[PDB]
Amino acid sequence: QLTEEQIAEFKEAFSLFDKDGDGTITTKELGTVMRSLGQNPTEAELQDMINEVDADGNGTIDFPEFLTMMARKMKDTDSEEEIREAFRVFDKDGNGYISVAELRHVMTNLGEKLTDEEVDEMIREADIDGDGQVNYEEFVQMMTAK
């Protein structure tokens, strides 16, 4: 069903939600993650999401339940397809380059406070060829390390 590489990647994802390491994701933990992404879920939304994934109706998500979800929805992700997907999302106009203005929009969309000086520094540090934007090879070099 699921390989070992992907079960390890999914456990690492799980750990980002299970902040107290108790082996369950609560509506509180899901809500914390969502608000860290700039989203504003209601408690009713959070409950609906937990209910969709929660196989034994105990009102929390254990790792087996989370794994069943990832296997239904993400059974083809690696560190590589995720970087490729992130680049496609960030490159709003689809020209194969991330601009200063595109990175500002991504930051807002993901609830990351910004300044112009921070965005400039980010583009300059990633921009290996000096053309003033970040192409995919540049992105991959910057994103390969966690």
């Binding site: 980002l16 939600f17 899901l30 992404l37 995720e82 980010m122 540090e125 910057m142």
Partner: peptide, 21 residues
């Protein structure tokens, strides 16, 4: 800062996982 690049990748990954619920 590289940390902020990495944090954005992780936020995008978390958004994709949240969208699976």
């Amino acid at each position: 800062k590289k940390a902020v690049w990495h944090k954005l990748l992780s936020k995008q990954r978390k958004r994709a996982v949240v969208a699976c619920f």
